[PDB]
Design a protein around this ligand. Sequence first.
Ligand SMILES: *[C@@H]1O[C@H](CO)[C@@H](O[C@@H]2O[C@H](CO)[C@@H](O)[C@H](O)[C@H]2NC(C)=O)[C@H](O)[C@H]1NC(C)=O
Ligand code: NA
Length: 260
Amino acid sequence: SILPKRRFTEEEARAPLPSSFDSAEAWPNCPTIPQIADQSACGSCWAVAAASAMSDRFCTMGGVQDVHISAGDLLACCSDCGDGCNGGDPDRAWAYFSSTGLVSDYCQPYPFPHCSHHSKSKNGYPPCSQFNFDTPKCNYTCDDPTIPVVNYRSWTSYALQGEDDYMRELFFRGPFEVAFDVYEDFIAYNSGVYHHVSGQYLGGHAVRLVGWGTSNGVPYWKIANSWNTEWGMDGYFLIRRGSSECGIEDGGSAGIPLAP
Ligand SMILES: *[C@@H]1O[C@H](CO)[C@@H](O[C@@H]2O[C@H](CO)[C@@H](O)[C@H](O)[C@H]2NC(C)=O)[C@H](O)[C@H]1NC(C)=O
Ligand code: NA
């Protein structure tokens, strides 16, 4: 990891964490948390999950109730992060949030429309396979140039590893970015607690971690996916917690938004 490891204070460390936890119920006055993103026909999961968590953390920590951080800005302008719509690194996305900063969804709206990721779309989105999107151009003015550019920054970035870090960080500071390996059997998930049993490896996938809990003696993470609200359980999925399922507990990325 390029980011420094998160160290917990003596007070944070000794906190008795609850058997279940939900970020939306923990910060009920933060409207960005329960919102689900759509990355569209682009490999921008690394950027979209980051911008979602940064938006959440401006409410949990930054003192701003409802600001949406522009995934598009991060996607296009962080060339050191990866190759835009062809994949990137969550760690470097958070490093960019502090060293340079990001505009809001209002300044630079996400350039790609809704599309269907699994199969059938009840709202009538075209298939995402129908679209082939290149990495958008990095812009330095708001799409509507008459809207002033407001730049949003964090003041620190750190990495996280393992069940306890994830839980402890989530509890104190809210949603952050994690990553895991996708297999064929994940694509059609719609219920239950996910566990890889069959299917070919497809690729890495960055996502936003919002909660934990236990269902019928099976501990799990509650995760916000970025395949719009029609995928999984209303945009979310549950995954096995405790034994790094698909490497979900191998690396997490987070930081603290600065009050502007
Ligand atoms: C930066 O602005 C440019 C130009 O306004 C955007 O590029 C256009 O994006 C639309 C919607 O995806 C496409 O239909 C056009 O073909 C693009 N035009 C050109 C000239 O590139 C771009 O999406 C913006 N970038 C971001 C990150 O918002
Ligand atoms: Na840990």
